[PDB]
Amino acid sequence: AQMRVVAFGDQTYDCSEAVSQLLRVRDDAIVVDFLERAPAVLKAELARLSSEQQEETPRFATLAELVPRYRAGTLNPAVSQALTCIAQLGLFIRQHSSGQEAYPTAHDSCITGVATGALTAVAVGSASSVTALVPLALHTVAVAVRLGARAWEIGSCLADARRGANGRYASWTSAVGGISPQDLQDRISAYTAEQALASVSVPYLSAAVGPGQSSVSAAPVILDAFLSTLLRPLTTTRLPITAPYHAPHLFTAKDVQHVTDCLPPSEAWPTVRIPIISFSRDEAVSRGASFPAAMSEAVRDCLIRPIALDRMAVSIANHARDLGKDSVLPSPIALSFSDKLGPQVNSHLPTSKSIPSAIGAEQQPMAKSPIAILAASGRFPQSSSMDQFWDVLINGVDTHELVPPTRWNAATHVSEDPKAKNVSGTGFGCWLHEAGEFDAAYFNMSPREAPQVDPAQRLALLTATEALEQAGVVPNRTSSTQKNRVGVWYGATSNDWMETNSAQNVDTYFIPGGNRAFIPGRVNYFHKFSGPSYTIDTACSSSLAALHMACNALWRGEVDTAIVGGTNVLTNPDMTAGLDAGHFLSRSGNCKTFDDEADGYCRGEAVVTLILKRLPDAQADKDPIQASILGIATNHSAEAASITRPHAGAQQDLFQQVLTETGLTANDISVCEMHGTGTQAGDSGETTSVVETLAPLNRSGSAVRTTPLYIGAVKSNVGHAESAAGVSSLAKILLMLKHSKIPPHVGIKTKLNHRLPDLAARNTHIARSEVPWPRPKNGKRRVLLNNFSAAGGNTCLVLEDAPEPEDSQEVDPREHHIVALSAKTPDSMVNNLTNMITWIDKHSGDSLATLPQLSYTTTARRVHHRHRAVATGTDLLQIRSSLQEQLDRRVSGERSIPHPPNGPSFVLAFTGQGSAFAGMGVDLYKRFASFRSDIARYDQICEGMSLPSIKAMFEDEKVFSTASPTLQQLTHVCFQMALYRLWKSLGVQAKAVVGHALGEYAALYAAGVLSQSDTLYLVGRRAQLMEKHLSQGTHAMLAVRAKEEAIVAAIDGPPGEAYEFSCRNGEQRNVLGGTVAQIQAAKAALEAKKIRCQYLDTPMAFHTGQVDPILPELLQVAAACSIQDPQIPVISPAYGKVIRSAKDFQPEYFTHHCRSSVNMVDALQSAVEEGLLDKNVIGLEIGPGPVVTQFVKEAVGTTMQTFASINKDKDTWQLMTQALAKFYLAGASVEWSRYHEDFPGAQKVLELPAYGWALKNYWLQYVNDWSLRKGDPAV
Amino acid sequence: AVAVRLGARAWEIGSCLADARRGANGRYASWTSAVGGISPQDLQDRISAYTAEQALASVSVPYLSAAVGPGQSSVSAAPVILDAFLSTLLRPLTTTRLPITAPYHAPHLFTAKDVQHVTDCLPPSEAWPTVRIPIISFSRDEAVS
Amino acid sequence: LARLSSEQQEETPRFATLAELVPRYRAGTLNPAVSQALTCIAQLGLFI
């Protein structure tokens, strides 16, 4: 008997943190859809207004850029009103969709609101769902802006803007305390009488709060004058109410009517179903009123009637009593001093947990989500990898140097005083000396084609590929990695390759090799990604602009995975001569950021590709996550003097724009990666914007910051990468996060820039030497990043630490593991082997979980090419020893030939029930899933057919002792079909099948003749027939090592009278059956001639005259089957022949089979004579023991490879890993994701060496300095 | 999620109950057909007898999947088995082939084990809502639940 | 669908949204697991 009250606030509550934490919401689609939508209905009603509103109308790109001007007081009443309303609705829409909180209903809840909250309250009371709240909620946004707008009309009319305002808008309202509302009203009246003031300009009591508290509104000049007359002990405190409200003398009914004219007339408007507590009226409760009428009435509360906040508490309580509720929950939304409400309402009157959901549901949706950065690879100056870049930064390395001769000759292109045309004042740069290296074979390029391709394209392909492997991305492996859900976006400032290098001789691959669009395109073509492809040029912000587009794609659901990168490689001296002509470039050296003498930026080269994914998909696929991007934003510096220099106002508004969109405050960002281009103006301007955003000073003068800020610029090291500048900065932070250190700042060579503000006073710092920067316990480190452009587009993002990696305590019980290596060239294979050995030597003793996670990583998360190598062992040392030996053989001249496209050929051998044993197949049954399903299936199916239950045979070993013939027989057949399903699932497709006796029934399923369950009906019914008619022990079977001729000559009596041949297995291997007396006599006759003879455990004598009575009924049950043509040939011992047609599987087959001898020799010879079997075929025993493979082996040759699935002696996974190794090397497609699926401890992505590239230098030399003579004749 | 696991399990038991024919071309055949002009119990008797002459496996048997009306009903079975059984039903009887691509409503095929398997995607918890609006379950002992 | 068996996957196609399975659902080439889920999506979609 509890009643929750939803209470909304007024302008006094600061919604900057509110709105901030709203655009953090990624946990529901209706929140972001509504919040994004709010500007639309808003702007739809923003245009019908007066002219003065069009004068001082601030700029706002989204609901974010309003925040800094809100805190600064430079935001008007119309928009600040709408902003508060949006924030209130957003928090509600959050809490009731994101927050899994039920929607208000008239029985258990009521609504209340103060000023803006009243408008908000109408909307919540009028809907039956959040989804139904959305449109009404927007109509309320339009009402809110027209409310604040009209208030500013009349308020501007009463008094205009003050001279000392400087854009800040003064507050029309003030809170008074220490006096009763009535006594203060008397003081107002007295002041009115004593001073000469108009009837409209008079002060008035705007609100009644408490016994000693209230609020008074007048003019900033008038209100100041009145408040100056109120002396201590009374209190006076300011409030952000920027227009006159609650003034029945200033406003009338026409103003209310007008504010609500944005609501079209209709009869379908929903009514107010939840009672709203309107406490400032005669009627405390109002329900059932239509939405427009309710809105106009709420507008009248705001504009006309005074707030009576002393009547709010009891007003709620009265209604609580009306419905017979003992107490209330407060649920305040953006309500000033909300904490004290609950006690106040309960004074008049006489426990939560989250609801989990499906795996991936309790978290946020897959539409919008804090995008995780999975991996990043790149090539940077003096760095072939991200790790060498960390070495550049942490050691304070400065990489600038004169242009190398590979690009152009500085002696002719550089002079201290450029005079001649196309000559520059600088030749400095931070260069990629390896940019020509590339592997043409990996990417299917001819040595003719690979030179003509831009280094941006080629290194984009390399870095992209590497980033994919680092993230363990296999196309079409998971939902997020499906080929049509993957996008690419790359920033590029110029293609100098086609302007300078390939331009000397144009050919067919000139345009494929030179246009910027192929940079992302080529990546999509190689990996077969059918998602979007784009190149972005915002100049020096290009990469972050591309990142922004990519983040938007993941945010709108356009792609699951996004590939983001940037490329800068400069082969063209003109770009130097022109940028230098524009005074952009430093003629002394690198970017010196913050240095008191900074003359420009130094060009640099970089190539980066990253992998981005929605966090739901990221965590779902167990991908690595180095960090997570909360958000990002872009504006343009329109207010600039010049096209050249972006200015600080736009930049600051953009910093708070991302702090809103992301949802944090200054104190949360502990480090800022600035876009420092080594300019006195740029550096001072940007620093001022950064500290004013992230390190403010209160009005008293102290620092707002509780923790330290550390500011730096990557450009002071590797120079200015232009398009790739943003990704370089981002690259820096990904490593800084990894190693938990801030590298030194080398930009200050001589003296700090004197134009900067005092950094120490605001707790900004420039780390000169490395500083410990550890992760707060149960917290996350957060960073602000920048990259800007001369083209004025400014872009920045906020980056946050990755989630906490879950601690998997389940240890892999598997003893033996398998490691899979692959490559496209023998050299590349040698490289990968060497690099893997060195990696094992690094991590040899770290942990035991390393080997399962290595197998999972190297297998399920890797693409597998034609050259392949494998190692298998119980610990990392065995793996190393194997890879080392095989590496030694490759270095010694062993040729690596790729396997054929078809792969190895297979014949599957199914054994009879003779060699079956207790606890057969139990380990696979315990640990695996699909096999368990197969067995459980056979159990429910057999229980449905009135056959015994087989599940107990694999659950428990004891039951094998007392098992009946039918149970053992069904268990055997079920075992073979489930086993065959497993091997079929692992990628082994059979060329033909051969069974022996009972194994052929599984062969009929494997061939496609019979279904599984039907096979169990036939076999089971047959066993019941054998138990029904025959008797155990009367007959027996004998295994004999000798030829048929010798056996016949040895036994007195012909075959078919004194005995019968049950099986003809091999040349000298035969089996005899008959009555016990016949077997005894035959055994003596054979032993007399020293022929080795041994008995079978078979109680009956199969394939002899014994089974005559069961054949008629077995014929009917053989007609019970539905027969189909075999999909592959069936080697039939029954008829001694290879059958391809269903005509021979007619019901007579199963009778013939039961009675007739099993001729393996005749069937196998028939198979080899057809060419179906030869030495190159690989036999695989599906069954308890290798009795049949030895017969096949005898038939075709001694060198045939045969491998058995199950054997009593050894451990199952040794056989498994060892078996998979041969097929994977000989070629096959094995599903590795399922091999590790039931072992979560093994599922993690290790950082392993990148693919060993077979690299060659592909380059077209720029020669003869022809760029200096542009426009001149030949001469 | 329960639906995709349901259809996946039923298709898995199509695979266990039979394979695809040669004339499919990727098309998945109909494992159910509607019969008319006969009462449900009489058709059940014809199922018993036609089966009994061939003694078809109680897994491969054509089974009565639905009782529609006094003369209508639906029978399910294999494209070869079903078409063979349907071939014995002659005019005035009607046969309309339905677009159901896996076997359902088969107590001789499924048990509680598979049912539980289908719903294993629902994590355990004590907070799951109950059924507040009555569901009319007409194929059970209790019409209302 | 990734938790399925090999026969349940090799014949399962790629799709981003539910639009690509429409023509093939008309053509009767769609598996029971997806067509089952599709019918369920349709029913819920119309009710919502």
From Swiss-Prot, chain B:
Signal peptide: none annotated. Disruption phenotype: Abolishes the production of cercosporin. Does not display any pigmentation. Leads to fewer necrotic lesions on inoculated tobacco leaves compared with the wild type. Coiled coil: none annotated. Induction: Expression is positively regulated by the cercosporin cluster-specific transcription factor CTB8. Expression is also affected by nitrogen and carbon sources and pH, and is also controlled by another transcription activator, CRG1, previously shown to regulate cercosporin production and resistance. Multidomain protein; including a starter unit:ACP transacylase (SAT) that selects the starter unit; a ketosynthase (KS) that catalyzes repeated decarboxylative condensation to elongate the polyketide backbone; a malonyl-CoA:ACP transacylase (MAT) that selects and transfers the extender unit malonyl-CoA; a product template (PT) domain that controls the immediate cyclization regioselectivity of the reactive polyketide backbone; 2 acyl-carrier protein (ACP) domains that serve as the tether of the growing and completed polyketide via its phosphopantetheinyl arm; and a C-terminal thioesterase (TE) domain that facilitates the release of the final product from the enzyme. Polyketide synthase; part of the gene cluster that mediates the biosynthesis of cercosporin, a light-activated, non-host-selective toxin. The perylenequinone chromophore of cercosporin absorbs light energy to attain an electronically-activated triplet state and produces active oxygen species such as the hydroxyl radical, superoxide, hydrogen peroxide or singlet oxygen upon reaction with oxygen molecules. These reactive oxygen species cause damage to various cellular components including lipids, proteins and nucleic acids. This is Non-reducing polyketide synthase CTB1. It comes from Cercospora nicotianae. The chain holds residues 146 to 290 of 2196 of the full protein.
